Each structure stands twice: as structure tokens, then as C-alpha cells.
Design a protein around this ligand. Structure first.
Ligand SMILES: CC1(C)CN2C(CS/C(=N\C3CCCCC3)NC3CCCCC3)=CSC2=N1
Ligand SMILES: CC1(C)CN2C(CS/C(=N\C3CCCCC3)NC3CCCCC3)=CSC2=N1
Lengths: 426, 428
């Protein structure tokens, strides 16, 4: 004995039908709106449509799940294998696409050359789509239609419990453990690496030890002067006066930033006194004010004041027009690498020319974190359900409620298909 | 329903013990105190040796058990089991890390190489290997009959769970890491061009040269323009497709070949340079073309005595004459290489930088290739017996016992993987 659920034959078909409509409309929109019209697309937005294709592929099989619940399984043997294969493919792909999104996001922040084009355009197939299909061979073989309880039951029939043990471990590892670690690794490094200081760290360079400037003068950090003396020990004492701790050579990056802020305060005060630069600076925004400071740090205030027409256009909010003027200048002729990045900051009013953290880029990353967590949040209650009864085998009274919740939680977990389209909305 | 190794296995255990202990002991004593020539591969090769020395030390217990009984008790039974598990997972993951190092060194020479060897090696390889040794602690116990030491699981389900974990973590997961690193290195591993890349430097992106014109690659001029509008125009036509200001090595070499052709045609029309050029060998002709890109045919033609010396094949005389010149005084690094190319007639001046990097690649290749060849007969053996557990082979107990006999011979013979790394230091 202990080899009947009234409520689950009204809950499950409603939940499947709901996810089916929301999935087919939601995702199908993603597929049509990006798939075709969209021309400026992100690396995340490329994986999000790859993910949308995967979630659409599964939602299409949902009508079969609803019929199999309320009534018999009429669809035959091939469709039993096909419905099992699509679910397998979806399970593996959806999570490992999220692994590629978190992996790409790592290379976007921590490594701002570009081996990301390889990932999104050619690795994604070899690494995600082909293995997901190869992982469907035991679902092609074992899934069959059988007569049980004056009905046709469609599931995977294994010859032994050792096979059940083989495939359950392969699913826990490949489906959840293996990408979960990859996903955690990327975000652990991202949050470890995580504005104006960073800009001048790239442009003027950072040195955490006393060096000889190009005109014979002792400096430390981003060209911060200590004293006016050709000796070595006289400048070493001047550091402790500002820093407040004994160093004897080596200084940290955060003590340096302290000296850098003292020089930015100085650059601002000087700009505010210079009659030509003062009105334009006040009209500019924090991002663009930081670009003007980059120039002032370079050739001085008199040099930046020399760009007459460029200044008025910046106040007149003409970024596109003031851009070509600085390319003809002596500043572009000398150092063209630094010059172009400063003009791009004036052009866009963003930290994009400097790459990684910035404003729009943080929001773009927050979007990626929400999606990944919400995906795990869907599957989480069901995992405890595998886990509780996954080890079982107290009594039949409690075992009836366990297997009941595993049906509900898997059905509610399918909301992960509706996550990506809902996230794009508003 | 199934109802020589007692002498042969301890012979293999003894051979692998003596070669292992001595070899790894030497690697630890020598490379442990060698601060001079320390190489990145040698840094992981010390971990691999420590992992293999810890295992070779437990082999006298393995030999004793096989012939006569387990005298060592319950504690040592767990210790020999854990060390075998530690050596099994770590040795391969060290080779997997060595494969990542070769990728990071060849694909792009940031510095994540020092972080892997000095700090990611413990958290990535040693900590997980000890975490994976926990089931072997709780399951290994000694039973009676004779005393038998092995892992005793409650049923066959536990046996299958760990057998799949061992196949996946021990073979599948690092095997992919190793193959992937290598198919990437082989991919991005495709003369005079590389000689001038070391000298002048390659640039895929558009750059103003020191003087105002627009240039791309290795000294390939386009035209005179006040803005980006006319620079890309001459580039896009010469390539044969849309560039958008970007090109690869395929296109850049095709531009370099044109500039070499113009230089060669220019050298041939010159009355001073042509007899010298024709007399010179392939490698030395490329050394002369190098001088033409730096100074110009007119400049190279100035070096009268030096040219006639090359024309007369008086190599050493021409090498000192070019070293005692303003060209050498101004650019010592480039000149010395070009001079030594004219002196030796070999690529050595340039392919003695990438000779220790190329040697490291081969050593790694042999070390990895030998490791899997050592485990290949054992993998074949287990695969056959894996299907015996899952019920495919139509054979009796005569063949079912023959495989278990051969699985033990191949396991003992696989241990030789502890001896590959030290033997490679002696031969290579
Ligand atoms: C893990 C898995 C894919 C396996 N499975 C199962 C077992 S098959 C199955 N119906 C469907 C599951 C999904 C594929 C189509 C059959 N059985 C019963 C038969 C009695 C009446 C209720 C449903 C139910 S939900 C679930 N999820
Ligand atoms: C895979 C494994 C670690 C497991 N195993 C086995 C099975 S346990 C075992 N004792 C050895 C296991 C390995 C450590 C030393 C004892 N059996 C017998 C006991 C009677 C004499 C022959 C071996 C043989 S060789 C081997 N290697």
C-alpha cells in the first residue's frame, strides 16, 4: 500500500495557463522588439533575448502540462520525450545564460580589451546551447508513456534507482551548483573592485612612492608637490604633515586620494577666481566640471583660458560644436590619447570614456543583479521540496503534503519565464 | 549474480615509491631554495610535487595491505584514504591552473598570473580538495574476516553518488579547463612582420605619427587630412570592406607586404644597394629592409664600407662598423638586434625573447599529455566495469574478475603520474 489530490487539479492548470499567456506575450514581445527592430543593443540585452528564446520554447509546451494535470495524457510517445527535452534544455540554458550575463558584466567592469564579442556572438552556442541539448539524451531515452491508474502517465522510467541517483546529482550540479558558483564568483570580484580620482589615475597616472618629476621636483600620488628642494629627506617629512602617519616610503591609495581632494579643492578655488572660466564652470554639471578640472591639471589655468570660443559654446550647451575646436588645438597635437577622453566627457556628460562605474552603468548592473536573484527566488522553495522528500526513501500523512507542495512550488517557479519581460516594462 | 596481484602490485608500488620519494624530494629541496630562475610553471610544479610527495609516502601501506594484512588500524586507514583523495583532485587541478597560466601568458602578456600562483592556488585547489576528503573520513573503517581497510557505504546509492563526483571533479571539470585553454592558445597562434612588430610596433587603431600624417599598423601611411573623413577613405578601399577605423593582423600584414614591396623595389633601383641585396640571404635581406624602414634607402646607402663588407660576406667586420655609428648610439636596442641578424643570419636576435615562453608551452604540453596517457588505461578499465554495474556486457565471472584484476594493475601503473614532473626536470 501507499503507492488523490482534488485542489491540485484546479491550482496547477490555472497557474500553467497564466504563465503560458504572460510568457508567450511577454517573451514574444522581447523576441520581436529586440530580435528585429533594435539596432543599438547591449551585451546584456543580447543574452536577455537568448534567454527570452529559451523561456518562450518552454511556455509553448505548457498547454500539455495543464491537460496532463486535469485529465489524461493523450499526446503520445514522441511528444512525451519532446516535452521532457524542452524542459531540460530550458532548465540548463536559462541559468547558464544568467552565468554568461554575470560573467560578461565582470569583464565589462573589472576589465574596462574586449573578449566579450567572442562570448555573446560565438561562445554562448558552444558553451550553453550545444551542452544543453547533449544533456537531453537521457531524457530522450528514459521518457515514455505508460498505463497506470486507468490513465496514461508520461514521465522518465529508469531501470534502477542508481540511474535516478546519477541524473539527480548531474542536475543539482550542472543545473544549480556549477553556475551558482560562476555567478557568485563574478559578483564577488565586481563588488571588491567597486570617480574624479579614477579619471586622473588613468590620464595623469598614479605612483604610490616619491619620484622625480620631469622638471626636477619631488612629487607623490597624482603629481602632488611636497616641498621646493632638490634633497630627498626634506620632502619625506612634508608627507607626514598632511597624511598624519609614519610611512618611510610606501603610501596607500586612500591616503593618496586624500592629497588629490586637497588639489581638486585648489583647482576649483582657482577656476572660481579666474574671470573667464568662473561663469562657464557654474553653468556646467558635476561630470563636465570634473572634465574642466582635468584640463586645468594639465597645462594650467592660462592654457585652458586660451580656448576662447570653446568656453562660450560649453556654457551655450553646445557639446557637439565645442568638440571639433579642441581637436585642432596644441593639446590634441601633443597627447591625443588623453585629449579625446576629456572631449568625450564634455560631449556625453558621462563617465563612459572611462568605462566601468559611472551612473547609467551602475543602474545597468543593478538590473542584472535583480534578475539573477529573482530567478533563484522562484526556484528556491521547490529546492527545499526536492531536498526534504528528495532524501525520503515520518509517514504517509506527511508525505502526501510534501509531494503536494513540490507540485505547487515547481508550478510557481515557472514565473522565472515572466521575469525578463516584466523587468523591461516601465 | 557473481559469487599474481599480491606480488605484482607491490612491485609497481615499490618502483613508484622509490622514483616518487627521491624525485619529489629533489624538486622540493632544489626548487624550494632556488630564488634566481624561478619560473611561473615551476611555482605550480612545486605544489604538484608536494601533493605527490604526500601520496608516495603512503605507498608502503598500500604494498603491505596487498600482500599481507591491514595492521595500521582505523586511524591510518582514514589518513591513507584522505591523502589519496587529496593527491587525486589537486594534482589534476594544479595542471588545470598551469593551463590557465599558459592562456594568460600567451593570449595576453593586467597581472592575474601572480594572483593565481600566490593566492588563488590554495582557495581554488587545496581547500576544495580537503572539503572533498570529508566523506572518505566518515566512510573509511577497518572490518574483520584478515583486516580489510576501505570505504564502507550504507548501500550502492552512496557508491554511485561519489563515483559520479569523482568522474566529474577529477576528470570532466578540469579536463574541459585544460582542453579549452589549449584550443584558445592554438587558435591565437597564427617572420619579417613579427621582426618589425618587435622593432616598430603594431597598431590596429588609427594614429597620428610623430609628424602630422595618418598612419595604421607598422608605418603604413594613408594621406594628409585635417580630420578623420579622408584617413578612413584610403584605408577602406585598400582593405576591400568596411573598416570603421578598425582592422586585424590579417589586413595589417597585407598592408606591410605593400610597404615591403615598395622598399624592395626602391632597394633594387638603387645602384649601391642592389648588388648587396642580391648577394644577401633571405634572413639578412629582411635585416636590410628593417634599416630602410628606420632611415630610408638613401640613409642605408650612406653606410658604404658596411654595405661592401656584407657584399663581400665579411659579417664580423660589417657588425662592428654598424655598432660604431650614430644609428646605434641613438637606437641601441633596435640596432643591436639588426646588427646580430647581419652577424649570424638567424632570427635568434628576435626569437630569443620568445624562447623561454615557447619552452614553457612544450613542457606544459608534455606534462599534461603524459599525465592523461598514464590515466588512460585506468579510464578504459573503469568505463568497462562502470557498464558492468549498469548491466550491458554479456560475459561471465571469469571476465568480470579479469577486469577488477586489470583495473588494479592500471591504477597502480597510473600512480607513475607522481614521477612525470621530476623526470621532466632531468630530461628537459
Ligand atoms: C521533474 C518533473 C519534470 C517530473 N514531474 C512530474 C512527473 S510526470 C507527470 N506529469 C507531467 C510532468 C511534466 C511533463 C509532462 C508530464 N506526472 C503526473 C501523472 C499523474 C497526474 C499528474 C501528473 C510531474 S511535475 C514534474 N516535474
Ligand atoms: C580505489 C582504491 C582507493 C580502493 N582500492 C581497493 C579496494 S580497498 C582495498 N584495500 C586498499 C585500498 C587502497 C589503500 C590500501 C588498501 N582492497 C584490498 C584489500 C585486500 C588486499 C588488496 C586490496 C583496492 S586498490 C584500491 N584503490
Amino acid at each position: 500500500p501507499c503507492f488523490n489530490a482534488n485542489f491540485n487539479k484546479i491550482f496547477l492548470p490555472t497557474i500553467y495557463s497564466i504563465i503560458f499567456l504572460t510568457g508567450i506575450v511577454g517573451n514574444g514581445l522581447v523576441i520581436l522588439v529586440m530580435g528585429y527592430q533594435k539596432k543599438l543593443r547591449s551585451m546584456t540585452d543580447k543574452y536577455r533575448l537568448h534567454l527570452s528564446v529559451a523561456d518562450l520554447l518552454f511556455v509553448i509546451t505548457l498547454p500539455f502540462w495543464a491537460v496532463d494535470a486535469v485529465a489524461n495524457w493523450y499526446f503520445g510517445n514522441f511528444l512525451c520525450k519532446a516535452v521532457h527535452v524542452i524542459y531540460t534544455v530550458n532548465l540548463y540554458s536559462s541559468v547558464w545564460i544568467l552565468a554568461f550575463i554575470s560573467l560578461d558584466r565582470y569583464l565589462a567592469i573589472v576589465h574596462a580589451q574586449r573578449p566579450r564579442k567572442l562570448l555573446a556572438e560565438k561562445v554562448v552556442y558552444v558553451g550553453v546551447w550545444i551542452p544543453a541539448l547533449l544533456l537531453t539524451i537521457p531524457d530522450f531515452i528514459f521518457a515514455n508513456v505508460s498505463e497506470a491508474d486507468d490513465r496514461y502517465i508520461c514521465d522518465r522510467f529508469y531501470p534502477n534507482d542508481l540511474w535516478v541517483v546519477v541524473f539527480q546529482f548531474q542536475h543539482i550540479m550542472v543545473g544549480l551548483i556549477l553556475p551558482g558558483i560562476v555567478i557568485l564568483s563574478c559578483y564577488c570580484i565586481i563588488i571588491s573592485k567597486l570617480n574624479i580620482f579614477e579619471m586622473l589615475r588613468i590620464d595623469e597616472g598614479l605612483r604610490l612612492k616619491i619620484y622625480k618629476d620631469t622638471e626636477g621636483y619631488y612629487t607623490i600620488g597624482i603629481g602632488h608637490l611636497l616641498t621646493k628642494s632638490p634633497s630627498l629627506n626634506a620632502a619625506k617629512s612634508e608627507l607626514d604633515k598632511a597624511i598624519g602617519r609614519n610611512t618611510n616610503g610606501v603610501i596607500t591609495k586612500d591616503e593618496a586620494e586624500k592629497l588629490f581632494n586637497q588639489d581638486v579643492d585648489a583647482a576649483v578655488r582657482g577656476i572660481l577666481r579666474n574671470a573667464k572660466l568662473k561663469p562657464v564652470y557654474d553653468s556646467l554639471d558635476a561630470v563636465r566640471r570634473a572634465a574642466l578640472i582635468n584640463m586645468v591639471f594639465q597645462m594650467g589655468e592660462t592654457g585652458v583660458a586660451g580656448f576662447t570660443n570653446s568656453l562660450r559654446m560649453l556654457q551655450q550647451k553646445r557639446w557637439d560644436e565645442a568638440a571639433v575646436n579642441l581637436a585642432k588645438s596644441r593639446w590634441y597635437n601633443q597627447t591625443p590619447n588623453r585629449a579625446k577622453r576629456v572631449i568625450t566627457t564634455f560631449r556625453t556628460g558621462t563617465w563612459d570614456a572611462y568605462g566601468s562605474k559611472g551612473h547609467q552603468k551602475r543602474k545597468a548592473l543593478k538590473t542584472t543583479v535583480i534578475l539573477i536573484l529573482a530567478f533563484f527566488a522562484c526556484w528556491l522553495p521547490y529546492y527545499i521540496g526536492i531536498s526534504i522528500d528528495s532524501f525520503i526513501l515520518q509517514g504517509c500523512e506527511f508525505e502526501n503534503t510534501v509531494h503536494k507542495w513540490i507540485s505547487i512550488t515547481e508550478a510557481l517557479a515557472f514565473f522565472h519565464c515572466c521575469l525578463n519581460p516584466i523587468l523591461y516594462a516601465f
